[PDB]
Design a protein around this ligand. Structure first.
Ligand SMILES: NC(=O)CC[C@H](N)C(=O)O
Ligand SMILES: NC(=O)CC[C@H](N)C(=O)O
Ligand SMILES: NC(=O)CC[C@H](N)C(=O)O
Ligand SMILES: [Mg+2]
Ligand SMILES: [Mg+2]
Ligand SMILES: [Mg+2]
Ligand SMILES: [Mg+2]
Ligand SMILES: [Mg+2]
Lengths: 443, 10, 443, 10, 232, 10, 10
């Protein structure tokens, strides 16, 4: 462990905190919280604070339900932005039923359940290394986002330079000051697009860090008079934003994906994991790409994946295996976008990987010949299949897959499906300005 | 109807 | 016949016409023409004027091809808007190959071919009564359409009243002075929406009248400082625009749909026609609803059809049979929208009806119990199926239908499919402002 | 739902 | 004191704080859900570990008393004209007289927590109500239920909103008053609620609320002009 | 490429 | 096509 109850009490004592946020994550991935005064810290640490657990369901909630707010001590973080009379600290909390049973509708609890299932298979750790990409948009006088990018930078360019600005540098340093472990940062392909990479860590810790990273990036961008968005494709004709997930499975403290006497230096467990991810790739796309805009990124020509295949060196593969081996052997899933719920996406990815391992599925041959030139029919006879083109198609594929349904349980499944169906129905009946530009004068 | 305040975001 | 060569020459002689438009219709339904001086009238009437026949293909044309421009004498019309030094007259012309064979890529020639096939079945005439409806939008200072409607009228309301304005009245009167046979007119359900009904006539004449009606309505609305659009759904949450098609089949000069001694006073031929329309309804939707915006109208709650069923009195049936019987016995197809190509839509409707008649298909039971009451699964067990929800789905349905393919021939089929696939691909990759309003700040 | 265009006046 | 302090602090931040039951149409209203717990000899009298739902007979009598007089004290718990624009379906505000442990907008809700924290929540109250008068009428109704040992109705856990008003009137589900005048009429006829505030308070409250309703009903609102000035 | 003038309408 | 994000600078 990192913190105990006495450490938390002493720390809030000297730092003089007055406001504590007991934050959690709902279905849609937005950060929710209930706030208590520091005088209620003892009640909070006793797992006694109650709240309306239906808020996890989002806008599809119906009936009020009382649940407990069991906090995690290791997630204690002091926010650097002092709130006038006193500081603000946060806890990331699990959701529990009034009888002490963990709530089945909590994405974090679902991820913990999937990790328990993984431990039942003999493995010890599931490490994740995220590569979240985001755009920076200038704000106007009224303080609302515009469509102007902060810089005309390029891939790995030294575009922001010195002499002020460089919001990426400030974000990286500030995150370092809060205890984050940042690996590297660079300017992304699209103008005004940036990427910050964290060191790999445990799945729960990685998802918590992803949520905190989104919050901190938005806040710091608001400091600099900028708007930071993790929207998959804010602009047409420009590279989208991905959240490539580097997954590594550990057994007895050693990497289970590495085998020095096997071809590609890959163990049989790694091949089974890749086969499991390939089999269910079209099914968990609804969870890893949960928005309507997510599928405008999944178009050819912008390095985003569009077909179910794995490779070591290819143009926009679904699964990429980095050259590094040994302890750093990992499988990268590039379909995930930053808009996805980290807990749900990790749950479905781990469930697919374990399904591949449990059934000893055979991985297909790697693709190293640029399938893009081949026609859709010219590659359908192979193992290459297309990812869903719309959110509705991905929802249809996700409903049919039995394994992916148990990956998040019946409560999460029904509520996610209802919310996404409402979201798609709202989008499909709208009349966009493009239609008026194309048809109002022509017809 | 039966749900307007929750779904008002759309 | 209505006009001869001598009559045309004499009419142009006294009316002093100097410009002649040899107009025709392409794949997309927009009116095209090649213009000649009056000195070339003799060459035009000799079927000797050449032009680039690839212009029929629209924006997917690849190669120039010489074609002839055989005009139709009965379509001669003198435009009321004088072109300063001389008047303007028009002919609607057929497209012919240089060897004298009619061009297979001409929608009008395709409709004539389908009518010849109908005559091969023993029938004489195929009458169409259209109900085109349109919106009137005010123009701004720069003379471009806005989103403000001309009036806040209602269904059959006396909204425009007297005291000027009343663009519908002026359009009706002007069309009457041009030789049109207007049946009745009224204000439509949506504000700023109007409908004008023609008397039923032959299929070719009806389609020609539809094109001329669109041209005249646009011109007259432009005169009144208004924008007239036949867009299927210009606005969200407001009634759409249809082109309900009243079809009546005649045999030996009498209505073949009428039978006084049968139930509903409907002949067996009428039931076979209804069965044929029902069977192929999901297949010709791509032709009758050829735009992306067409499927935003096909949504529940606005009296537009959404399911394949026929009835005598129901809320938004696909096929409606008016109460009038005898000579006026007809079947109304309400899925068609004004954006559809009249020739292609009539061709596919007639082909489906003849397929029903030729194979003596059995019509399903009429529905009179409000299909909207039950769920989609609660009605799928019956014969009620859903219309395609997007242009891509309708394109997929249309490609698989063997009968509907020959309804317009190989040339028209390939070019229409290519153009519509390009249109859908352009739409699906766009990032609409709705997506930014929904996700730019949320994520 | 089932009636939106008619009651659009309200 | 909370209302005063909130208004003052919001004024400091350049903001306006209002406890109006429903300031905007089509948007969720503002409630003042009241969690009531009765104690006897320093212990919670609503808790009974050996009974169903872990609820004592005193709690059931209290619920029955609140249910019986619910349509009568609505005039006190919802004393404004705007209060009844919140009491409309679809915004989690109660609209019918029923009690439940888990339902969409019940009049009386019993939280899951038990033992010392056993309580009954009345969700009809809005922040515009007078706290002393609302507490007085709620306590009087609860004591009336306890004193006469009234039998509480069966809890509703099937979403009363599903079926029609005629499809729920045959049960024990009755509708709350729709307007302030209707609530005043219901409140006047309830004898027990009359003593809940005494004759002086009763007469003055009735006079003030009748004047309030009369002023509202004779006004011509802009909605009427938007609906009828051009149509007729 | 190979078709830019005709497809310029999009 | 097949390369639009990288070549967008031109
Ligand atoms: N060069 C990169 O790796 C960027 C990836 C790309 N932005 C995506 O959305 O996947
Ligand atoms: N009430 C009517 O006939 C109007 C029909 C409706 N506008 C449609 O699009 O079909
Ligand atoms: N979610 C809630 O509890 C809000 C209650 C609601 N605002 C009311 O007026 O009762
Ligand atoms: Mg990157
Ligand atoms: Mg990567
Ligand atoms: Mg009409
Ligand atoms: Mg009609
Ligand atoms: Mg409450």
């Amino acid at each position: 462990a990192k913190y105990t109850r006495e450490d938390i009490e002493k720390l809030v004592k000297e730092e003089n905190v007055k406001y504590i946020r007991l934050q959690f994550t709902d279905i849609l991935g937005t950060i929710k919280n209930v706030e208590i005064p520091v005088s209620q810290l003892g009640k909070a640490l006793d797992n006694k604070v109650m709240f309306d657990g239906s808020s996890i369901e989002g806008f599809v909630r119906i009936e009020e339900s009382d649940m407990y707010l069991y906090p995690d001590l290791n997630t204690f973080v002091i926010f650097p932005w002092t709130a006038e009379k006193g500081k603000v600290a946060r806890f990331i909390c699990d959701i529990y039923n009034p009888d002490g049973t963990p709530f089945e509708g909590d994405p974090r609890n679902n991820l913990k359940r999937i990790l328990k299932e993984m431990e039942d298979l003999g493995f010890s750790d599931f490490n994740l290394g995220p590569e979240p990409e985001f755009f920076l948009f200038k704000l106007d006088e009224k303080g609302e986002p515009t469509l102007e990018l902060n810089d005309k930078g390029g891939y790995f360019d030294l575009a922001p330079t010195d002499l002020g600005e460089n919001c990426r540098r400030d974000i990286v340093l500030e995150l370092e000051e809060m205890g984050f472990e940042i690996e590297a940062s660079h300017h992304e392909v699209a103008p005004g697009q940036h990427e910050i990479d964290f060191k790999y860590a445990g799945a729960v810790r990685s998802c918590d860090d992803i949520q905190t990273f989104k919050l901190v990036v938005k806040t710091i961008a608001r400091k600099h008079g900028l708007h930071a968005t993790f929207m998959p494709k804010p602009l047409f004709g420009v590279n989208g934003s991905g959240m490539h997930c580097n997954l590594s499975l550990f057994k007895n403290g050693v990497n289970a994906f590495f085998d020095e006497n096997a071809d590609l230096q890959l163990s049989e467990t790694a091949k089974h994991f890749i086969a499991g991810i390939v089999k269910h790739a079209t099914s968990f796309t609804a969870v890893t790409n949960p928005t309507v805009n997510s599928y405008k990124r999944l178009v050819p020509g912008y390095e985003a994946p569009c077909y179910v295949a794995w490779s070591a060196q290819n143009r926009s593969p679904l699964i990429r295996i980095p050259a590094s081996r040994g302890i750093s052997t990992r499988v990268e899933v590039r379909s995930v976008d930053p808009a996805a719920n980290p807990y749900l996406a990790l749950s479905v990815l781990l469930a697919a990987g374990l399904d591949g391992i449990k059934n000893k599925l055979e991985a297909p041959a790697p693709i190293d010949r640029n399938i893009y030139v081949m026609s859709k029919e010219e590659r359908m006879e192979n193992g290459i299949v297309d990812l869903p083109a719309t959110l509705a198609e991905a929802l249809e594929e996700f409903k049919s897959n039995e394994v992916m349904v148990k990956a998040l349980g019946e409560h999460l499944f029904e509520h996610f499906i209802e919310a996404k169906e409402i979201e798609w129905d709202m989008f499909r009946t709208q009349v966009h300005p493009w239609e008026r530009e194309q048809y109002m004068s022509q017809y | 109807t039966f749900r307007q305040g929750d779904m008002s975001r759309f």
